[PDB]
């Protein structure tokens, strides 16, 4: 009762009919009273000569007074009264609600344009938090509603709160909710949706200073008040799922869970510590009866493993990560594909694992469903060669990859062929050899042989494909005279006898093909001018060319596309194309100009009974067998003895090659040595 | 009975105990019989001296004979018999099934690696189509099963049929199914899923030599037999939905409809004539009770409108396109958003429509939900300026666009402000003026004034944003002293008095801010110490988050090069060229949080518009009357912000004014 400090303000605050107080006088008085109360020290203060105003500052005439100033000052005063009297809690619950609706109003106006009393309201909110009087709001019979309202105030989009207060707003909402056991779903929708509805980094721009109250608030709550929020997050997940589930609309559940998963994915990125609150649901979702939810859960954890996080998922939540890798054996193929689709990014984003991955992909590469096998080989296509070489190391993967090249299934086989070839190419142009990676190389080095062995299956499409693929990735057409050979040897380095016999056969055919296209043009030129409509050979040469064209078209998958193509070329009867074509097949051409005639030739055919595109894809593959690429001025480079001694594995190839080049057709071979002499 | 031609083959084909026929002999004999029969004439032929072999060629000893050859030749022979005896069909349905399982076998082997009788089987399939004998398969009691099998054969991925036969394979399946009224769903999922599972733009990677039977077949069926297939396509859609609905799994339907929609989207791209078969379902889906199906259906047509097609959707199926644009008034906001999200790509892809769109966006721009509004203004952000200027022309769009910049809703306000600024910038650097777009320019010309008037709201965040926006799009730092002014005048060209007062105030403030930040390090170098605190708190008073500034400057001062950069940026009177160089490096290194803090301060603190530009603003050619009157307006103030300069001339001018 007795104190050293004392309230020195004693002016009336209530306007009656007998004695009236002007609005301005009342404003000034309430200002004074506010300023004075603020200064008061809680412990050292009379407090007895203050009930007068305790009783006065709750009059509805002031609570709902027109002038905002009176209301704001009243708010502050009451803020202080609460602070001084506590922990006695002088007002009754009713009065306290009446006060706390006023404070909410003040908070509401705080986000509005300045009413000239922003400062008072700043004081209000700050001091309501500092002295923790705010939480009184929670012990009221209307607390839930007041909570919802309190939250809607600050999360309202139409309000513009300054950034300075965000830490305070997160405080207010922090404390007020820390007193709650069961928070209304509404508030939680409010708090959590902000993760969905506000994604930074979405608009590339100059400063991105824009910022958002509700989001930072959500972060403050989910970071600073994690321990109390997690409990609710769990309830949010379960309740939302529960709500969607029992919904009359039967197609909502999936749509909402797919959203929850996004909420989760964001939380993991922003506040990974919270994910613990719902990780169990996911864990159980992976093993759910409905395949779709397993698919989604798989996709989710798939997304998680590729996201930047201060925390580490496999360390933190190994339990479910194991359950994640456990989905390479899910009954539903869709789930397996869903899993397998995620690896490239994972590998591309984390080296954390090369153990379970290598364990899993091995099974994924020999799965009964061709979709997953395709999605498996797609790895070698989508993620860069280097990261493959670094991350995946299991023997079985490569063997299976190459193994599928002989598979019945077409769509897999083709992709396989193309992939492992482009891979072979890239797997030499980027990765060198050491003492430890050579262990798998004996597989990457048997790629060309394997490729060349496909010819033995005798399929037109496959032969066409291998033809196309070899000259695309293996034996390229660029970029110089020496390295083509240097690599050529490395391609020939690891061959079995079959690979050599086929390699040579393919070359033995080239001369017979050249001897055919040359005569093809020599016979096609017959329509340059009238030589014999029915004269010299009219009745006989037409049926030599006509029947000759079938010979070259007997090796192509779609002969009816071949016989049609070149006849239209006879329809053309343009000399340029004939000169280039003829030039490509005549044998003995410097390697460099061949490229020049070929590229222009193919480019020329583009964009002029059906589309020429065909004719291009026909004559190109047809040329790959027809023209000389390997037996040419390369000879001159193999001729130069690159090494005095050593490198026996190179000289035996020099031999293997030249020995044959001298045998298949020596019209070219014996001449260079003559030039050398 | 009497004919000119007669069967000249009369060797036995059935091996009995008394007389045995070697396998090879049987091969040769059946070969001969095949060859002979092949040449026979269908109408002009005895046909009586043939029953002998008709009866023999159904014996299980031949039909299911071990040697593939026997079976192939038997198949061919039978194929010719069917053709010769046609249309009488002497055989029983049973025998005919037994034959047709054999033919199916042959087709099966036709896609396998060569079996040595590939020729005979090619002949088989070809002539079975030419003489149209295949369709007999359809009038059997097991026809459904044989159909399913027949289709499974060719759509089999484990089989590799040569390309030359694809047109024929599309024929066989064409005819055989053209005889069916109720096709087992299996076949239709078979035919149609192929559109989903094989996209010819996913597989190009080198030579494009790849091809696939099932797909080309599906197209042939859906193209050449469109009239016959659409009829089924309808049934496929309805049945798929019906199955999905009652599938007990309650989340199945949506996944299935979203896939059907993809099927549709592919069909429109490849065979747009077929969409007629299901366009009604979509039409009714758009007006469905469930919002989600409306949403999906809406986006679908959204997708349609952006794809290259030999046909035109708004012309062909206007009925539903109207129903699509009818979705700007759907009860469900998600649907509205879904609609509004598709336009940017559409407009950039089609000029076909500028009437209904302009009609709609006006409505979309004043929607009660801020989401649709945001996604509306996003148009001006995502699609290039030109396409905007050409495609959308309605007054309401632009007015609403600029109008939303002053709306209570924040997320709208912000995007609005930034967007119309980027638009302003791009809308002068790229688009010229004409007779009727000037009417829109007179609105686009009020962007700078509107922006500068926003400062008067006195919101820290807004002021920060407008600050950021101005120096990014309106008054950039690029590229050299000579041109900046020329356009600076053009932005200042259309100002009201407020815009000028604020424009000048911003610079009257600039010197006082410089006067502080310059003093900041000068105060940090250490009676003034308790002024440092007040200036340092003062400098952060203009910022939305001062509590992030006061920490920032302590973090930079914690060190106690950058200091020189700051001084250089703030000292005033700096060659604008170096300003850029010191400015950029500072932020680039300072970035990799704090970076976002000092920049905004610099935008208000450092000299950009009042700088070495002045010597360039002084030099004129006389000459534009619209520029020279403004140059005074500017310099006049520049003399007030800093009288250090023009104090010498004007005084002498004052004297000569006096002497007068």
């Amino acid at each position: 009762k007795g104190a050293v400090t004392k309230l020195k303000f004693n002016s009336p605050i209530i306007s009656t009919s007998d004695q009236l107080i002007s609005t301005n006088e009342l404003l000034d008085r309430l200002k004074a009273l506010h300023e004075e109360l603020a200064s008061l020290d809680q412990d050292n203060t009379d407090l007895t000569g203050l009930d007068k105003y305790r009783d006065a500052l709750v009059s509805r005439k002031l609570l709902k007074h027109k002038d905002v100033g009176i209301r704001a000052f009243t708010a502050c005063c009451l803020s202080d009264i609460l602070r001084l009297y506590a922990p006695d809690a002088p007002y009754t619950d009713a009065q306290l609600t009446d006060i706390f609706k006023l404070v909410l109003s003040q908070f509401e106006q705080l986000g509005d344009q300045e009413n000239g009393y922003h400062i008072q309201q700043t004081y209000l909110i700050t001091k309501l938090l500092e002295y923790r009087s705010i939480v009184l709001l929670a012990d009221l019979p209307s607390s839930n509603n007041l909570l919802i309202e309190l939250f809607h105030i600050f999360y309202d989009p139409n309000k513009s709160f300054p950034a300075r207060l965000f830490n305070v707003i997160g405080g207010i909402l922090g404390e007020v909710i820390s007193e709650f056991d069961s928070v209304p779903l509404e508030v939680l929708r409010l708090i959590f949706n902000k993760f969905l509805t506000y994604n930074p980094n979405e608009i590339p721009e100059g400063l991105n200073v824009t910022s958002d109250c509700g989001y930072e608030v959500s972060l403050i709550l989910c970071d600073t008040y994690s321990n109390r929020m997690s409990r609710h997050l769990t309830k949010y997940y379960s309740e939302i799922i529960h709500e969607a589930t029992n919904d009359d609309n039967n197609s909502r559940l999936l749509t909402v869970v797919v959203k929850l998963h996004k909420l989760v994915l964001r939380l993991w990125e922003t506040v990974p510590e919270l994910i613990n609150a719902v990780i169990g649901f996911i864990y159980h979702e992976l093993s759910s009866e409905n395949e779709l939810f397993r698919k989604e859960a798989t996709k989710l954890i798939g997304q998680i493993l590729t996201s930047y996080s201060d925390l580490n998922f496999v360390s933190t939540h190994s339990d479910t990560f194991k359950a994640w890798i456990s989905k390479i054996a899910d009954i539903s193929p869709d789930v397996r594909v869903e899993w397998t689709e995620s690896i490239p990014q994972i590998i591309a984003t984390r080296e954390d694992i090369s153990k379970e991955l290598n364990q899993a992909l091995a099974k994924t590469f020999i799965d009964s469903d061709p979709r997953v096998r395709r999605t498996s080989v797609m790895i070698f296509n989508k993620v860069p060669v280097t990261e493959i070489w670094k991350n995946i190391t299991n023997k079985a993967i490569y063997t299976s990859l190459l193994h599928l090249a002989r598979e019945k299934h077409k769509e897999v086989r083709e992709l396989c062929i193309n992939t492992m070839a482009k891979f072979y190419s890239n797997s030499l142009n980027e990765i060198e050899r050491t003492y430890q990676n050579k262990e798998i190389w004996e597989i990457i080095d048997t790629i060309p042989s394997t490729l060349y062995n496909l010819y033995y299956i005798n399929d037109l499409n496959i032969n066409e494909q291998v033809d196309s693929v070899i000259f695309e990735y293996l034996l390229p057409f660029e970029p110089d005279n020496d390295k083509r050979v240097h690599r050529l040897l490395t391609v020939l380095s690891h061959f079995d006898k079959k690979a050599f016999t086929s390699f040579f056969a393919f070359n033995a055919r080239q001369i017979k093909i050249s001897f055919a296209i040359s005569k093809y043009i020599d016979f096609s030129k017959f329509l340059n001018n009238q030589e014999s409509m029915s004269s010299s050979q009219g009745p006989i040469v037409m049926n030599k060319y006509n029947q000759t064209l079938q010979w070259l078209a007997s090796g192509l998958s779609d002969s009816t596309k071949a016989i049609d193509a070149l006849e239209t070329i006879k329809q053309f009867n343009d000399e340029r194309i004939f000169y280039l074509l003829n030039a490509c097949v005549t044998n003995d051409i410097p390697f460099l100009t061949f490229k020049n005639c070929y590229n222009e030739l193919v480019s020329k055919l583009q964009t002029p009974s059906i589309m020429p595109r065909d004719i291009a894809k026909v004559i190109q593959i047809l040329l790959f067998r027809a023209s000389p690429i390997i037996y040419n001025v390369s000879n001159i480079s193999v001729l130069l003895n690159l090494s005095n001694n050593s490198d026996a594995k190179q000289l035996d190839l020099k031999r293997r090659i030249l020995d044959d080049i001298s045998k298949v057709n020596p019209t070219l071979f014996k001449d260079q040595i003559r030039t050398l002499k | 009975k009497g004919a000119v031609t007669k069967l000249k083959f009369n060797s036995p084909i059935i091996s009995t105990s008394d007389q045995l026929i070697s396998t090879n002999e049987l091969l040769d004999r059946l070969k001969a019989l095949h060859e002979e029969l092949a040449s026979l004439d269908q109408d002009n032929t005895d046909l009586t001296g043939l029953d002998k072999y008709r009866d023999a060629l159904v014996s299980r000893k031949l039909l299911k004979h071990k040697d593939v050859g026997i079976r192939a030749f038997t198949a061919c022979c039978l194929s010719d018999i069917l053709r010769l005896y046609a249309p009488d069909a002497p055989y029983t349905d049973a025998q005919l099934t037994d034959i047709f399982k054999l033919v199916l076998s042959q087709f099966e082997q036709l896609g396998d690696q060569e079996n040595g009788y590939h020729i005979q089987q090619t002949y088989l399939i070809t002539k079975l189509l030419e003489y149209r004998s295949i369709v007999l398969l359809a009038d059997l009691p097991s026809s459904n099963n044989l159909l399913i099998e027949l289709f499974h054969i060719f759509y089999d991925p484990n089989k590799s049929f040569p390309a030359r036969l694809f047109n024929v394979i599309g024929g066989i399946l064409g005819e055989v199914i053209s005889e069916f009224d109720s096709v087992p769903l299996e076949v239709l999922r078979l035919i149609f899923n192929k559109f989903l599972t094989y996209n010819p733009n996913e597989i190009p990677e080198g030579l494009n030599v790849t091809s696939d039977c099932g797909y080309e077949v599906s197209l042939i069926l859906c193209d050449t037999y469109s009239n016959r297939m659409s009829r089924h396509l309808t049934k496929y859609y309805s049945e798929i939905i019906h199955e999905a609905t009652n599938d007990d799994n309650n989340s199945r339907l949506l996944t299935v409809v979203v896939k059907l929609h993809k099927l549709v989207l592919r069909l429109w791209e490849t065979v747009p004539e077929l969409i007629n078969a299901v366009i009604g379902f979509i039409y009714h889906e758009l007006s469905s009770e469930n919002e989600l199906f409306r949403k999906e259906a809406t986006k679908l047509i959204g997708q349609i409108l952006t794809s290259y097609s030999d046909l035109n959707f708004v012309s062909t199926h206007s009925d539903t396109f109207k129903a699509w644009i009818s979705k700007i008034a759907d009860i469900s906001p998600d649907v509205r958003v879904e609609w509004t999200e598709s336009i940017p790509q559409i407009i950039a892809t089609r000029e076909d429509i500028s009437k209904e769109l302009n009609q709609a966006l006006a409505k979309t721009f004043i929607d009660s939900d801020p989401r649709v509004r945001r996604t509306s203004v996003m148009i001006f952000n995502k699609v290039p300026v030109t396409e905007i200027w050409k495609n959308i022309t309605n007054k309401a769009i632009y007015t609403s666009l600029l109008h939303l910049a002053r709306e209570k809703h924040k997320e709208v306000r912000e995007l609005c402000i930034n967007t119309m600024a980027k638009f302003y910038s791009n809308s002068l650097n790229e688009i010229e003026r004409t007779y009727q777009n000037k009417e829109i320019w007179e609105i686009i010309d009020t962007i700078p004034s509107t922006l500068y008037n926003l400062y008067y709201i006195n919101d820290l965040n807004i002021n920060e944003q407008v600050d950021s926006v101005i120096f990014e799009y309106l008054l950039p730092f690029e590229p050299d002293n000579d041109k900046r002014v020329h356009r600076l005048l053009t932005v200042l060209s259309h100002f009201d008095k407020k815009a000028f007062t604020s424009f000048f105030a911003f610079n009257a403030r600039q010197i006082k801010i410089s006067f502080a930040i310059s003093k900041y390090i000068d105060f940090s170098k250490f009676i003034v110490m308790n002024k440092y605190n007040q200036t340092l708190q003062w400098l952060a008073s203009g910022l939305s988050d001062s509590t992030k500034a006061i920490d920032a400057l302590e973090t930079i001062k914690q060190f106690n090069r950058i200091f020189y950069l700051l001084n250089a940026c703030v000292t005033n009177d700096i060659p604008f060229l170096t300003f850029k160089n010191c400015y950029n490096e500072l932020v680039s290194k300072l970035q990799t949080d704090i970076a976002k803090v000092i920049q905004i301060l610099l935008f208000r603190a450092s000299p950009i518009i009042y700088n070495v530009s002045n010597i360039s603003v002084l030099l004129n050619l006389s000459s534009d009357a619209k520029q020279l009157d403004l140059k005074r307006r500017i310099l006049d103030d520049i003399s007030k912000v800093n009288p250090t300069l023009f104090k010498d001339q004007i005084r002498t001018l004052k004297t000569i004014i006096k002497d007068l």
Binding site: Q113, E114, N158 | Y456, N463, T501, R509, W538
Partner: peptide
Amino acid sequence: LMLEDAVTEREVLVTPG
């Protein structure tokens, strides 16, 4: 509702002292 312009031409981006 719509936000309202609420200051005069004199005090804009002003700072005392």
